[PDB]
C-alpha cells in the first residue's frame, strides 16, 4: 500500500521537472516512516 | 456429419467426429498431437 | 490457474440460468451483440467470433503521460486494452447511442484508430473478498469500467432481445481464459489446418 501510494505520488509530478518545497517535505515525512518500516521486517528475519 | 447438413439443427448425435491412432477391441492438457 | 497477458479469453455473464457471451461480427455492423451458449446440446456455437485477447495491462492511469506525449502480470485495478482474433481491432465505445430512449445508454464497438482515449477499460472487483492489487484468476467476479467515459457493460432490460450497453448498471462478468500461449506445431482448439494425404475440398447445392 505504501509503494503503490508513493509510486502514483511520483507519477503525479513526473510532468514537472523542478519540484518545490512542501510536496517534497510531504515526501520527506513519508520516507522518514519508510526509514523504519523498511527494517521493521528485517529484525523479524535476521534471527537464526 | 456422409455429406454436410445444416448447422441450424446440427446436434451431438449427428455431427461429432474424433481422432484416433488405431484403436483395438476396447493448466493445459496432455501433449499428444504432432 | 492464474491470469497473465496474452490469453484468448471470452467474457461470460449469466442471467433458467442463461449463459451469455459477448460476440463480435467485424467488417460491418460495428455495434456488437451477444450469442447464447447455455443451449449447446441443440446448437453448435461460434467461438471465433468471440476470441478476445489483451496484450497491454498498464497501471491505474499509467497513460497519463502518454496521452500528452515480456508478458506482464495484471492486477485488480489495472487497465485492459482488448483485441479480437478475427478483426485484429481494438474494443472501444462510441458516443452516439442507438438506444433512442434518453437513458444515457451508450453502446460499444470497435475502432480502427489506436488512440487510447476511449479504448482503455480499467478493472474493479465486486465484493470486499478481494481488494486493490489482488490476484486475477479464472471464474472470478468482474466489474469493468472505462477511463474517458466510465460506464459499465450491462444487459438490456428495456425492449426487444438482450444486448450489451454502457450505462449506470453494474453487471458481473467472467474472464474465462480459453487458449494460452502454446508452442508451434502443437494444435489447440480453434486453429484452422488441413488434412493432406489429396485435399479435403468441396466441389464448385454444392454439398
- CB distance C207–B3 less than 8 Å? yes
| Neighbour-count burial of C21, counting CB atoms closer than 10 A to its CB (0-12 exposed, 13-18 middle, 19+ buried) | buried
- According to the annotation, is A43 in a ligand binding site? yes
The answer to whether B16 faces chain C, any CB pair under 8 Å, is no
Instruction: Render the burial of C122-149: b for 16+ CB within 10 Å, e for the rest.
Output: bbebeeeebeeeeebeeebebbbebbeb
Nearest by CB to residue B7, choosing from C44, C186, C207, is: C44
Report the DSSP beta bridge partners of residue C154. Answer: C165
Q: CB distance A15–C62 less than 8 Å?
A: no
Enumerate the residues of chain C whose CB falls inside 8 A of the CB of residue B27. 1
Element (H, E) at C68: helix C64-68
| DSSP class per residue in A5-48 | HHHHHHHHSSS-SS--HHHHHHHHHHHHHHHHHTTTTTTTTS--
DSSP secondary structure string for all residues of C121-138: EEEE-SSTTS-TT---BT
CA distances from A34 to A11, A28, A46, C66, C98 (A): 19, 9, 19, 30, 52
> Chains A and C: how many Cβ contacts under 8 Å?
11
d(CA C26, CA C110): 8
Antiparallel, parallel or unpaired: β C12-14 and C19-22: antiparallel
Neighbours of C152 (CB within 10 A): 18
Physical contact, B and A (3 or more Cβ pairs within 8 A) = no
Sign of CA dihedral C65, C70, C74, C80: positive
Q: What is the C-alpha separation between B14 and C83, in angstroms, rounded?
A: 34
Nearest-CB residue to B12 (from C41, C188, C207): C41
Query: C50 phi and psi, to 5 degrees?
Result: -135, 25
Amino acid at each position: 500500500r505504501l509503494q503503490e501510494s508513493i509510486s502514483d505520488f511520483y507519477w503525479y509530478y513526473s510532468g514537472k521537472d523542478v519540484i518545490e518545497e512542501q510536496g517534497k517535505r510531504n515526501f520527506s515525512k513519508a520516507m522518514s516512516v519508510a526509514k523504519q518500516v523498511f527494517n521493521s521486517l528485517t529484525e523479524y528475519i535476521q534471527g537464526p | 456429419a456422409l455429406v454436410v447438413v445444416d448447422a441450424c439443427k446440427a446436434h451431438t448425435k449427428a455431427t461429432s467426429f474424433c481422432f484416433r491412432v488405431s484403436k483395438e477391441k476396447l493448466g493445459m492438457g496432455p501433449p499428444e498431437i504432432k | 490457474q492464474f491470469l497473465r497477458t496474452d490469453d484468448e479469453v471470452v467474457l461470460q455473464c449469466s442471467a433458467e440460468q442463461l449463459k451469455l457471451c459477448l460476440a463480435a461480427e467485424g467488417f460491418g455492423n460495428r455495434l456488437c451483440f451477444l450469442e447464447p451458449t447455455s443451449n449447446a446440446q441443440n446448437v453448435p456455437p461460434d467461438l471465433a467470433i468471440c476470441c478476445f485477447t489483451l496484450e497491454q495491462s498498464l497501471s491505474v492511469r499509467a497513460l497519463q503521460e502518454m496521452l500528452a506525449n515480456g508478458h506482464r502480470t495484471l492486477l485488480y485495478g489495472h487497465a485492459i486494452l482488448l483485441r479480437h482474433a478475427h478483426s485484429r481491432m481494438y474494443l472501444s465505445c462510441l458516443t452516439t447511442s442507438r438506444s433512442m430512449t434518453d437513458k444515457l445508454a451508450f453502446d460499444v464497438g470497435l475502432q480502427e484508430d489506436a488512440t487510447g482515449e476511449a479504448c482503455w477499460w480499467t478493472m474493479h472487483p465486486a465484493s470486499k473478498q478481494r481488494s486493490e492489487g489482488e490476484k486475477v484468476r479464472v471464474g472470478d467476479d468482474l466489474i469493468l469500467v472505462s477511463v474517458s467515459s466510465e460506464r459499465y457493460l450491462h444487459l438490456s432490460t428495456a425492449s426487444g432481445e438482450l444486448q450489451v450497453d454502457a450505462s449506470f448498471m453494474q453487471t458481473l462478468w467472467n474472464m474465462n481464459p480459453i487458449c494460452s500461449c502454446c508452442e508451434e506445431g502443437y494444435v489447440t482448439g480453434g486453429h484452422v489446418l488441413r488434412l493432406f494425404h489429396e485435399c479435403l475440398t468441396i466441389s464448385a447445392q454444392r454439398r
